[PDB]
Symmetry: C2
Subunit: 286 residues, 2 copies
Amino acid sequence: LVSEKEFLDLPLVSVAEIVRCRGPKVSVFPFDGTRRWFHLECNPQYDDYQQAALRQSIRILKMLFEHGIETVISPIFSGDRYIVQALEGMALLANDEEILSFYKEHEVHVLFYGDYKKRLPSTAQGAAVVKSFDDLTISTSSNTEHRLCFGVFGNDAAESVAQFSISWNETHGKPPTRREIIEGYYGEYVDKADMFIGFGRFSTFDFPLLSSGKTSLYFTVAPSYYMTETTLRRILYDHIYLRHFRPKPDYSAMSADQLNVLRNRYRADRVFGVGCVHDGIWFAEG
Amino acid sequence: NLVSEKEFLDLPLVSVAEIVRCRGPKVSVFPFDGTRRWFHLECNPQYDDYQQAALRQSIRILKMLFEHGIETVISPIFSDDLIVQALEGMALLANDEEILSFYKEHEVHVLFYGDYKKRLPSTAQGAAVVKSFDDLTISTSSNTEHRLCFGVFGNDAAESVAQFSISWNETHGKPPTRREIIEGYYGEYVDKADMFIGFGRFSTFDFPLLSSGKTSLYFTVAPSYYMTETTLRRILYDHIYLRHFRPKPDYSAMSADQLNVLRNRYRAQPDRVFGVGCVHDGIWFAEG
C-alpha cells in the first residue's frame, strides 16, 4: 500500500528491502544502443568506445545490485576480423581492473552462458577469452551476495539442452529435471526472469529458459546508459505494485458509466510498439 | 518498397497479403487476451454465452490474420505460466462445427503444442480430447494455405526437449538438430516468430523455441477482440517497413544537427520508459 511518490521518496535501503521481499529477484538487462550513446555523450574523436562503455555498464550493474536485485542477466554479444578487437572487448569483462574491483566490492559471482565455446574462433585469443571466462567464474565463486550472468552467443539453447540431456540421462538413468537443465546451461540454478529492461524497438533476446508470461517487459526510449535512479525506481514500482495489483478488476461491480468509459475508449487503435522513423532511427509512438 | 503508411492503408487487401507473403510476418504469435473484460463490455453477461462469443471473435481474428497473407499463426490458448476450467475449451477448438468449417474453408493446417498430454486429466475424457487433437491434425494435414498452432500448456519446453532428445539419440545414435527439436515439439518445422501481438501489460509467453531478438513485439491497449483491420495494418506496416529500415544508422556520417536532435531529446526527456503503467479500479494501463 505504497504510492509512487512515496516509493520515489524512500531511502535506498527501504527500496532494497522491498525488492528483496517482492522482487524482481532476477533481472535481464542487455546494454543496448551503446553506439548511439557513445556518439551523443562522449567524444568519438578522442574517447575510446570500450572503456567508456564498460564504465557505464559498471555504473548500471552497481545500481541494480544496490537496489536489492540478486541476479542480473546481461546478454553482451550474439566488419569481419575486427574480431580481435571484439574479443578484447569480451576480455575486459574478465581482466579490466575496475570491473574486477567491482566484482570484489559488491560480492558478485560471475557466470557466462551461451554457445561461446564453439562459436568463438579457434585461435589462441579465442581460447584465451574462454579460459579467462572459466577462471573468472572460479575466482569469484566465493562471492554469494549477487549473481551476474553474461550472455555470449546465448540465443539458441535448444541444441545445448539436447546434448546436456542426452549425457545426463546416460550417466544418471533418467532425464534431467528442469532445475538440472537450467543449472547445466547457466552454471547454477537461476529463477525465471522477473523483468527485462530493453531499449528502442520492442524486442527481447538472449535469456533462454528463463522467460515467462510473468516476466515484466520495459523499453527505454534513450539508450540503456542514460538510465537514471528515478527511472529505475519507476520501473521497480510498476513491477512490484502495479503489474500484479490486487484485487483484480470486478467488472460486475462497476457502474454503468465506468463500463461506458472503458467501452468508448476501446471502441474509438492504440498499440504500443508501433513506431515512426526519423533520420533512419525508429522511435516508439505515444 | 518506398511505401508510406497512408499508401499502405489505402492498398487493396490482395496487395497487402502479397506484400506480407513477400516480406513477412510469416510466423505471428497472437494470444487472445483480455477476454473477460471484452465480454463484460461488448456482450450481455446476463443473456449472452461466454464461450460462443469468445470463439466467434477468435475465428474472426484468425480469419483476418490469414487473409492478410500470414502463413502461420501461433495462438497460446491455455497458459500455466500466466483444467481450472477448460479441458473444455480446447475440446471446442477440435470439435465445434463452426470452427471446423473454418479450418476447412480457409484450408488451415492445425497443430497443438505444449504439455497437454501430461497436464490434461488422466480420465477417458482427457484421453478423448487428446485423440481429437491428433485426429484434427491428421484430418487437416492436406490443408496447405495456412498453419495454426494452438498452445495448450505450451510454456517451459525444456523437459519436453530433454525427453525428445533422449529418445531421438536412442533411435538415431546422435542428438537431434535444432530443426528436429522444433519438429518434435510443434509436430512440424516452424520458423522463428516474426511478431507477437499482446495486450495490456507488456509481457510475452508460450511460443517456446521460436522467440528471437527479431521478433517484433506489440501491445494493444484494448483487449484482443477489439482488433480491427486498420490496427492490424498499422502493426504490419511498422513491422515490414519501419522495424528494419535500411540503411541502418551511420552516426559517424551524421551531421551536427542530426546528432543534436537525438542528444537533446534524450537529455530533455531523460526518464521516458514504455511499459511503466498506472492502475485504476484494478485495471493496469500503459502510460505514454
